Structures are given as structure tokens and as C-alpha cells.
Design a protein around this ligand. Structure first.
Ligand SMILES: [Ca+2]
Ligand SMILES: [Cl-]
Length: 302
């Protein structure tokens, strides 16, 4: 009863799913799991001047995201990654910007924006030829190792690893440069997932297209293995203007595939693939940091 990833992706899209709370101009960089049968969503916020983070009050249906409470974190967790770490029965929120390049906090209740532990170092390395430094981390474990993947707004994708038994912990400064292309082709927003029912991992990377932001996909048989381009052009993207079915945005940008199993394996079901992304009105201009990003959800057409 298993499904495979398609060679060509076709989606349908929701409209804009929520408007930012008073004081914010954008909701961004989503990470989501299903928790107690409800959607649990963290994201970045922007006021235009400063970036913060938030969690939505849990909601069962995407169509009710618009009415969900928006709960600011007292300490910013920009571009967050949320998961449940089963081997230690603890939730993890990883993010960027703070005392170290990447940071994490832990909790027993991921619904509380302010119930997270003191910040701990996740990654302390540095990259060359980048205006941003390490950005847009994700974490994913198989049965043996925990992996860190990240970007640099510079055409490179990077990876680090540790035995799972040493996590939660600090990857330190070391990393592997696993992919190298143009800045436009491998920009940011990297995510990695286990494809349920297949001996396959899925990587998506946000690219800058002629028509807007879009995602390029790659596959691997192992998390330490090589990545083969799948749907990796603007005309044949993982998700973008070409195939999103979205009428409100020409950009499909930093988000997360919907993870029903909240655990560290980042497993997605190819039979019911959905993508919580950020988009924006095509008419919106101004400084990048003030852009009015909004959540939407793509559902894969089978
Ligand atoms: Ca992310
Ligand atoms: Cl590695």
C-alpha cells in the first residue's frame, strides 16, 4: 500500500491561511508536526525591523489556522526546526542567531512558546563566501546518526553528523560541503525528509527563479550519500509557480512538508504529501525584511 514520489509534481493550493498579529508584517520559515491530532506550527516573525518567532495555538484543520492564537516567543528562534526526539523523550527546537551560529532548546511541552530550556550550542562553524553565514538549518536522523543540513545564501549545501547517542548535543565547527552550484540554484530553505515506504530520502532546496522563489528536489538512498536531482528546474520544480496551483503568490518559499510523525526521522507519507510554505502577493515591494510573507498549504494531486 506504499506510494512513490512522482517524477513530475502537481499541487493544489489553499489561499492565504492567516494574517500576522498586530506588530508583525510577516509570518515565515514554518516548521510543523501533528501533535495530539492537531497542527503544531512554529515560524519566524518579522516586524520589518527585527525578526522573532512564534507558535500558533494548535488547530485541527488548516482552514482554521486563520483563527488560531498567535503566541510570540520571549526569546527569538529564527527559522526554527521542531521535532520530538524519541530516544530521550524530549522535544527539540533548533534555530539560528544567538550565542552560536545554530542553537537548540528542549521542552516537554512544545505548545508553550516560553516553556523551552536554556539555549544550547548546535553548531559553531563558519563558511566562506557567504553574506549570511550558516542559515536555515534542519536536523534529521536515521536509525544510526543525527544529521545537520544547512545553507549559506551562496550556492552551497552543507552537512554535519554525529552518532544519535550523542544527541542532543553540539555538532561543533566541522562540516562537509555536499553540494555546490550557483547562488540562484541552491540558495536557502533546505529541508530533508525520509520517504515512508521507500528506501529513499528527499531533499528540497529553495532557489531564486526568474518568476519567483521555488523549490528544487533531490533524492538519496542514504543520508550520508550523494544527492541526485529530481524535480530541479524552474519549469519542472518540486514546488513553484509552474505547478503550485496558487493564485495569490508567485513565490513558494521557506516552509516544511507536513510531518504526521513528529519524530527526529522527519518522515513524510508520499501517499498524502502536503507542503506548508510561505508566499507573498506578487505586488508587494520594499525591503526584503519587510515583505508580507504568509502561510499557505499545497496538497499533492494524485
Ligand atoms: Ca527550515
Ligand atoms: Cl557529515
Amino acid at each position: 500500500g506504499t506510494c512513490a514520489l512522482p517524477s513530475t509534481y502537481r499541487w493544489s493550493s489553499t489561499g492565504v491561511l492567516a494574517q500576522p498579529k498586530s506588530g508583525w508584517v510577516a509570518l515565515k520559515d514554518f516548521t510543523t508536526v501533528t501533535h495530539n491530532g492537531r497542527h503544531l506550527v512554529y515560524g519566524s516573525t518579522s516586524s520589518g525591523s527585527s525578526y522573532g518567532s512564534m507558535v500558533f495555538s494548535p488547530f485541527t484543520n488548516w482552514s482554521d489556522m486563520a483563527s488560531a492564537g498567535q503566541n510570540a516567543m520571549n526569546q527569538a528562534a529564527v527559522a526554527p526546526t521542531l521535532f520530538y526526539f524519541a530516544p530521550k523523550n524530549i522535544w527539540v527546537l533548533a534555530y539560528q542567531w544567538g550565542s552560536w551560529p545554530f542553537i537548540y532548546r528542549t521542552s516537554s511541552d512544545p505548545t508553550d512558546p516560553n516553556g523551552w530550556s536554556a539555549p544550547q550550542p548546535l553548531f559553531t562553524g563558519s563558511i566562506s563566501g557567504s553574506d549570511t553565514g550558516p542559515i536555515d538549518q534542519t536536523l534529521i536522523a536515521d536509525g544510526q546518526n543525527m544529521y545537520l543540513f544547512f545553507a549559506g545564501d551562496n550556492g552551497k549545501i552543507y552537512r554535519a553528523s554525529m552518532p544519535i547517542g550523542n544527541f542532543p548535543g553540539n555538532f561543533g565547527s566541522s562540516y562537509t560541503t555536499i553540494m555546490s552550484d550557483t547562488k540562484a540554484n541552491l540558495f536557502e530553505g533546505v529541508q530533508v525528509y525520509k520517504v515512508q515506504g521507500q528506501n529513499q530520502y528527499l531533499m528540497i532546496v529553495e532557489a531564486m527563479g526568474a518568476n519567483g522563489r521555488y523549490f528544487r528536489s533531490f533524492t538519496a538512498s542514504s543520508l550520508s550519500g550523494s544527492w541526485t536531482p529530481q524535480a530541479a528546474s524552474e519549469g519542472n520544480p518540486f514546488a513553484g509557480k509552474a505547478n503550485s496551483g496558487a493564485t495569490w503568490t508567485n513565490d513558494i518559499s521557506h516552509g516544511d512538508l507536513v510531518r504526521d510523525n513528529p519524530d527526529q526521522t522527519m518522515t513524510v507519507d508520499p501517499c498524502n504529501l502536503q507542503f506548508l510554505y510561505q508566499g507573498k502577493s506578487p505586488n508587494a515591494g520594499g525591503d526584503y525584511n519587510s515583505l508580507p510573507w504568509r502561510p499557505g498549504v499545497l496538497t499533492l494531486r494524485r
